[PDB]
Ligand binder design. Sequence first.
Ligand SMILES: CCCCCCCC(=O)O
Length: 133
Amino acid sequence: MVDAFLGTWKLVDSKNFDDYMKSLGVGFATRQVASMTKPTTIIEKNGDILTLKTHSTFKNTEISFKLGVEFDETTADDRKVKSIVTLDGGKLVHLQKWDGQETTLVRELIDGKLILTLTHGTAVCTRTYEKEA
Ligand SMILES: CCCCCCCC(=O)O
């Protein structure tokens, strides 16, 4: 049910990521660097537990979770959030909540590419990842 998302993915396109980061309050110097970074995202499962790694020259993150079970997360920009990841319409939907705020990170597969849509406030960012062999 998560199976086609699994593997190693490389960023190959990004739209409106600065808008998204700015909406979250990320400072200008961090946004510079992030705008030029091409992370690698690794999605692995072991039974019911998924692990999602994001690696770059700037920041690294790792989360582990079961689908449909809330978990604590500390994001790349140091927000302490309550998170849940589910499958919805075949999309992997990650919802983060903190301070009454929310942001969604939605992943879907289109033509074999992994499209990540990030929404916070009115900002909508679309990042495209391609699978590494
Ligand atoms: C720093 C803002 C929060 C995380 C951004 C995730 C981007 C990505 O995985 O391509």
